[PDB]
Amino acid sequence: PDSQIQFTRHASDVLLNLNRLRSRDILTDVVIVVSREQFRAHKTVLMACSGLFYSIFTDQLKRNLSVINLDPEINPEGFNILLDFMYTSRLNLREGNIMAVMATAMYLQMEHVVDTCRKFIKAS
Amino acid sequence: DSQIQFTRHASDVLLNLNRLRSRDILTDVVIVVSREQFRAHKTVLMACSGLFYSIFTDQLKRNLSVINLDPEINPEGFNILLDFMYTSRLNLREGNIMAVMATAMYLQMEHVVDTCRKFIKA
């Protein structure tokens, strides 16, 4: 007969490794500019987690762009929280930044994160 | 402070990378295995394989878009491991486990090699 082995922590090991590559600046293929700050990253991971990035890099005219400039209303700390979440599965929230996180998540079109922020606010 | 860990996040990200690969989106390297070409993402290859990690960290090979593997390597075996990289599922037959193991050995996928090693005993 046939056989199969499912490695249950494989995806998590891949994601850790993608983050290690990011932290060392290896194979990063885009810089996200958020006002005065810059975040180096992998297009594939951004696409995987965000509707906005997915749309941006699915566009033929913008596929091979290496710098993406976000709306200047977006705060860098909020984008960093969400970038860290994309690469770690961990969403860090304080009461002092959840509106900023939520607002950023709405702009990036990360609806599951938006909804988690919604539910946190109801449990204040 | 508060923290939320999303336990299926990595699995969702991996599924989405595989969906991108199936549609040939942002694939950036062709792996040649005898007469067969496999399109993939360098980042996923590096994350799963010691050899690809070494190839794509090499200054002389970082910006190459085609990699030719050793011509002894099986295409079916490489395909089984490529599927595993993007899905976490290693499909094995008794007819191809040695090819898979051999290919895993060549790609420096030691945890996969050792998993096959345990089965051959059982």
């Binding site: 509707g51 988690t116 | 860990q5 969702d12």
Partner: peptide
């Protein structure tokens, strides 16, 4: 009064086939 939550719900959009 902080907390740590492990949550198994979907976290991100699904890219279609």
């Amino acid at each position: 009064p902080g907390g740590f939550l492990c949550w198994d719900g979907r976290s991100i959009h699904e890219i279609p086939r």
